[PDB]
Symmetry: D5
Amino acid sequence: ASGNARIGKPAPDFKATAVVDGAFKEVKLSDYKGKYVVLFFYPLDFTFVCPTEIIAFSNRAEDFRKLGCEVLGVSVDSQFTHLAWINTPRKEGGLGPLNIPLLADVTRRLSEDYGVLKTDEGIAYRGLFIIDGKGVLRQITVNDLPVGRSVDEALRLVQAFQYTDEHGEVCPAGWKPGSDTIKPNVDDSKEYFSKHN
Amino acid sequence: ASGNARIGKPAPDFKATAVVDGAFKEVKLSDYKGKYVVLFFYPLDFTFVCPTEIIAFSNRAEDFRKLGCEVLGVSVDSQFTHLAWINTPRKEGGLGPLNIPLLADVTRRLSEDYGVLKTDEGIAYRGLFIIDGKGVLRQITVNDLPVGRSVDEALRLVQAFQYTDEHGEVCPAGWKPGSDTIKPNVDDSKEYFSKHN
Amino acid sequence: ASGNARIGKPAPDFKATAVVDGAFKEVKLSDYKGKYVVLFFYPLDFTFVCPTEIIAFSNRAEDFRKLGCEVLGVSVDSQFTHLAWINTPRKEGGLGPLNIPLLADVTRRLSEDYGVLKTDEGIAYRGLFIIDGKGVLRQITVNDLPVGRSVDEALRLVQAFQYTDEHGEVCPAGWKPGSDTIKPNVDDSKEYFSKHN
Amino acid sequence: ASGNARIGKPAPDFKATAVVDGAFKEVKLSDYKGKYVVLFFYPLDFTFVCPTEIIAFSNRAEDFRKLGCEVLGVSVDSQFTHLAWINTPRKEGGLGPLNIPLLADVTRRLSEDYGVLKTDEGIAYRGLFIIDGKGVLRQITVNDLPVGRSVDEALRLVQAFQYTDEHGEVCPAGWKPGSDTIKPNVDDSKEYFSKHN
Amino acid sequence: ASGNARIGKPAPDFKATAVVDGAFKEVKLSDYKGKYVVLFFYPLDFTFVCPTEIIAFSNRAEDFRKLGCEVLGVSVDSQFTHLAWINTPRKEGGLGPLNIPLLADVTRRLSEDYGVLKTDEGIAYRGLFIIDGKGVLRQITVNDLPVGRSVDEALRLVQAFQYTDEHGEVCPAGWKPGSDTIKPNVDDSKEYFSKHN
Amino acid sequence: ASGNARIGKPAPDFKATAVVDGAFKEVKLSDYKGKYVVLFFYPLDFTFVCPTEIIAFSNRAEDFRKLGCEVLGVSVDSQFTHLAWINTPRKEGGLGPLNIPLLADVTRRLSEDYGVLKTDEGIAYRGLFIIDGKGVLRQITVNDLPVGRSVDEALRLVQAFQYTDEHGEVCPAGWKPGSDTIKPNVDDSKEYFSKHN
Amino acid sequence: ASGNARIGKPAPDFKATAVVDGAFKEVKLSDYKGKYVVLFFYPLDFTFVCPTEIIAFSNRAEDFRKLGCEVLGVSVDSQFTHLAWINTPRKEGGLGPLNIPLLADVTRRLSEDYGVLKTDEGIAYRGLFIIDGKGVLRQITVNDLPVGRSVDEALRLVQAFQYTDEHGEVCPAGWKPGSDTIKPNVDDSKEYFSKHN
Amino acid sequence: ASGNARIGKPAPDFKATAVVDGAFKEVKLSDYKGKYVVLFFYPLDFTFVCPTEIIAFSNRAEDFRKLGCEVLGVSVDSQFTHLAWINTPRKEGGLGPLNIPLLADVTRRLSEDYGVLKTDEGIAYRGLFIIDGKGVLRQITVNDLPVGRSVDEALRLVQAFQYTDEHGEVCPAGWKPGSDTIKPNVDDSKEYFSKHN
Amino acid sequence: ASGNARIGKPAPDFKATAVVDGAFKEVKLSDYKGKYVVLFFYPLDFTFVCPTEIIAFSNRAEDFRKLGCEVLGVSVDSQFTHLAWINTPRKEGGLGPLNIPLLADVTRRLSEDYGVLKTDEGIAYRGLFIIDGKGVLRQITVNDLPVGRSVDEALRLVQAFQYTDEHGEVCPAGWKPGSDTIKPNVDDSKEYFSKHN
Amino acid sequence: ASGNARIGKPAPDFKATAVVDGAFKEVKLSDYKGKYVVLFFYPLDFTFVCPTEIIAFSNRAEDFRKLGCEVLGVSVDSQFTHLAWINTPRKEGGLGPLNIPLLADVTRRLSEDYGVLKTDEGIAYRGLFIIDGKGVLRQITVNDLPVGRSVDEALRLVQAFQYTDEHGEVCPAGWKPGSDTIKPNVDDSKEYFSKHN
């Protein structure tokens, strides 16, 4: 309804200062050519749902990396606030040491380009975007602010997109690694349907 | 973020002819005021991922209705095609009997209003929208065509939004029934952060 | 009143996926250079006048091909629905095997370009167009939805346009093969008028 | 599809001077409320296909009148020229006495409103329009100039539209008085399909 | 007030099918380079003032031709109507054989370009235009419909414009061949003024 | 056809200071309601054709007034120049005493509104305009500068419009008082055509 | 407030037919390169203040020409009216023989370009313009109609501009040949201020 | 001709702070109803021509006041700068004591409304304006910067406009008190013309 | 000079969530009617110059409040970040307990309305604004990012504006309490200039 | 809020005649490349705050020059007014001899480009601008009219900007030469924060 995030088209380009390994660094979409990217927006540092999503993705960061997928978090806060929050203990609502980059969208350019800026408050909705290794947007998930996202579902979707890319079959509702897939033509699809009904 | 579909605003109204219990009936969003609605778009009748999503949501329709949530499926196909697909056995790639309405968006107004029309093919992307009982859009999920959605995650999200609606706490990453929630102010949030770190 | 179909001008170009001998194939107007084309739109797969028209044209298709004329059927339904309709027995309202292509106009571009889209429903009127081997539109017929067309009249019109094309005489009202024609100049036309009156 | 001519909408209003029983009289669409109207345009008085069409319709005008349908011809020529042509013997290419009104469209307003003006010559294409007793346009037929229309088919179409008007069944391809019709709903149409296949 | 007819400027180009000696022939303004042209428009074939004007000019056509002036008549009627009118005896309101071309302005371009189209009826006013041998418009005469023009006055004007062209003197009011002219400078003009007052 | 001068429509309004019987007086078109008006424009006081037309109209002014027609002359020169020219003897190229008003169009509004301003010189062409007693323009005559008009033809046209106004017959080519007219309907016109051919 | 006459900028270019020594001649601003020009407009030939201004300037024309300044008079009247007025005795309000050109601004271009047209009457105000030998406008004087200008003041201004041009001193209020001037710098102007106060 | 300054129309209103007998005071055009006003712009305080003009007008202010005319000087300088210049001795380039108001136009609205702003320096040209007791602009004088105006000519024009106001005669070139005027009609003007030639 | 910030006019209104004594509260400009406000923007929480300014104003807060002036800081960071910074010890670059409100401009509306947003970074320049008890902006100070402001000067300016508000005298360069002021009129100002020079 | 003065971008260029050492001279921004420039606007010569500001900056001009910074004053007054004010004793409210250029902004271009024109009075606000050797605007200070600026603070700011320019550390609140600066990065800034708290 706003922005440039269109499924099946080049994901909107982005460039931002990020906190990586406790220091500041530039991060560009072009750095991830050939890898999947999970780009997740959250509204505000030092709030409530947001730490739980950042910590859960960070904790699972290596599961995504094994599949060749990089997880990036972003909010409109600055890298200085991000680092203050990292340097805050998890028992006190902080992030502690982090295993994924935290990008600063201080100009709001990323949130606008991805169509997730809550304009009346100046903060990003809980938008998550899956981008494949060719740079194409494959998936858009946007939650209203009071409800966190699911790292498990994000991982399922990355796995499913990579599987369909690699084999040319399509993934049924609720597919997980090991589940049956469907050959996408009228005749061959009957192998799946005869078995599952 | 979807055409006129904006989180936190009234979801775009819709009116459509639907197949309901093997017969044709008009269905309107206003019919569901006071109830949650899961509205899911799918690209094409008589294809491959789409039946698996329609059947999965149909099979679990009652779980959503036990929560006061109605599930509605939508594609650009006509009601006559829908019915022909309902009348095709599941083993042959049909839908068989269905326990959810199947809306016909032959004018494409619904797909355009929700921002999910893949214009170059004239079909809807795999867009799912969660609308609360006040008619406000709370959640947007959109998949590229080869990967089906998760009925479980749809259910988790509806459970989560209903839980935050009633209790005024917020749901952390991965929340499900039985999970702790956070009191969204700085002092009261500490109860959650100390317990879980 | 809408669209680009103008008698005496190049017919609106079209390209569409079609069902041809039970398989999917791209069909485009340029495939027919040097042949007459009868392009007929119908509103909806799995309805009632439409199969009778499609079957009547399919059954006479060779009568057109002997004249070097190709008959093409088109609706806004997808090729998957077309195929399910072809695989439905005629006794049950299906098409059965067909001897003409059935084009899928899912984007509605063909129906818009030919001015036959019934916008408030998103379906094509019963528009039939006759295009000569030069690619020029020669005839427009458009019926409201409840009244089928006549295959006999379409064939007569093709015959008449081919005859005037080759001989430079003009075809009176009601002309069929074997009927007298008029030499369209003031002096030579008296041969017809004085004979037939 | 023609200028303001849209199937299923009110037919473009018209008012013209006509020759009626050898005298001048104004003719307007509103005169024919409660009756069907067949309005046929032709390009030029004192030419070749046109007299054969006007004569054929005039000869058969009572076959339309018995059905409550009025036939009206129209070209851009003036009523004075129409009267001259009526006063010319048919053996010399004239019309002789006529049993239908011949309208003068010297301003070209009718031709423009019905979308049949051939602009590079300033004459009407051979457009025929069937309007019902409620003034709604039901049918459009336009031929290129060298090929005359069929009075049989016009009559069949008038008969078809009146039959579906009165009985709410639909007319298959090639329908003629006495042929079977289809009840346009999924269950009741099976009567037709099983009997005819 | 409308059109492009401007005294002292190149007359608007025209190209028309005409009846010439009972046959059809293209006539273009450029055909007349080096000759004067009297182009007279009239409203309608088979009316009342029009034939008397056409016949009056046709009867006097050789008086203009002897001067190197060609007379051309034009109305919005077609060449087929013109010929029919020529083939009608003068006693019955016809033209009989004509000694001038009669141009068909069926597209109304000539009438619009000379600014004489009566828009509410689609017919030309009684406009007459004198064009010199360089193709420059010299004179505009336009009458309302009920009053015919004067061939005598049109001849006088052609003679006067040729006289001034050749001799560079100017023609007083009512000048006719044989009358005194004025040398158009202050001193030499007194030759005229002293004599006639 | 001149600026705002449209035959059949109210003549463009005008008001001007004029010389009338050697004094300055306001003249307005509304002064002549109920009377015919001949309005003639000429380019320049103290030139060559102009005095001959002014004197000729002045000399005949009573022939026009006996018909209830008022003759008005106009140029772009001021009333002081008009008066000086009236005070110049005709033997010297002056006007001498005048029997018609001479309007001063110093703003050029009259010439512009009547479409006769020769813009590259700022002077009016020899435009003459016949306006009826309803204020409706009936006739437009415009000569290039070197050739004077005919007062006899102006009088004939006034006589003819008044004759057709009062009797409802139309005036053939070259009609003068005493000449036959035509009854402008098909049947009654035969009286003239058979008498005169 | 209108036009293009701007002090310190090139005077608006002009070209006009003029009466010069009793004959017609083209006069253009570029003819006066290197000379001063006093260009004076007046409203109307054959009026009252204007002859007195024209005669005054003509009587003094040699005083200006001794200084290398050319005087030009202009009104909207034509050259024929100018000559008629020159040929009128001064005792009767005429100009008699003149020693300055009288330009005819019949298109009003000069008056519009110099911003002196009184639009409601179509005549020039009493505007006088001093142009130096480089073509730059130095002075603008405009009087309402009832009050004539002063030739002595125009002469004083020409002398003053020429003196400042040549000496680069500035001319105090009321300066005339022989009067002191001011050296326009702070230090050197004290020579003047101490002497005269 | 001056921005909004149009001869014969109400002079542009103005309101300004002014130095008046060495104190600050608001001065507005409406203060002078029923009195003539000579409003003169000059470019800059503490320059060279300007003080001679200001002083010359001040010295003659009672001369203008005995005629009911108020003189006002104006520049873009502030009232504080005006007062410093008044408090500067005349021998030093100052104004000494003054008998006329000195208006400050530091917004440049007066200079822009009177069309005398030299835009590339931000200072007024030497524009003088004569406004009559009814508020109507009668006279515009503008000098380029190096040449002062003439107080005697300003007084002459004030006298002349008051004389024509009072008596309804017009003032010939060079008119002063004691000179004859002209009765502005053709017949009474002969008294002046015969007497002075 | 800042976005909507114009000296002498009502300061741009603002409303924002702020940290006030360790808790969140809405702060609006209307809260301070009848009091002076020093509104200072800074670019980023958890950076370097910014904490020194915030602490310096916090430490001096009561000096301002004693004069009836309220000091307000603002940055684009959220109130959660502000509170985390306040809860950070000054020795680590935190703010510690603060005596002044810290406003959150997460929408950037305040920074835009005050014209201080550094667009390419999305952060506010070091803009300081002094607003009087009537809500009128009296002072704008904007620093580039590397250079902090002076609290001593802000206080001096508040005192200076308050003094001039009460006593209607004006404050020289470098005025501090106890310093002489100037009576702003020509005569009474000499008291000051003679004393101090 | 108006004009082009943007911190961190090239300062608006300027050109102007100034008084320098008692004489007139052109000054332009490009003259000061490689030097800091303090450009201060003031509203009016011969007023009250302004001289005290100009004298204070002139008295301390060598303090700035030693630092490679040039102080320039500017008001809308002309250079002749400036020189007169400079020639007025300071005891009289004059400037006396001056050690800084005073620029004349008579066209108001400088005040508009720097956005400090008080448009309703046409005079500059007390805007001061600090520009670095690269021409980049570094500081903006604008006071309402009744309060003078502080030369001490202007100098402190020049000193601060020069210091950060050369060393790349940032200047805390109130920094004066010899005060500690901050290294602008997270870790190195700790040296300052631990020392000073």
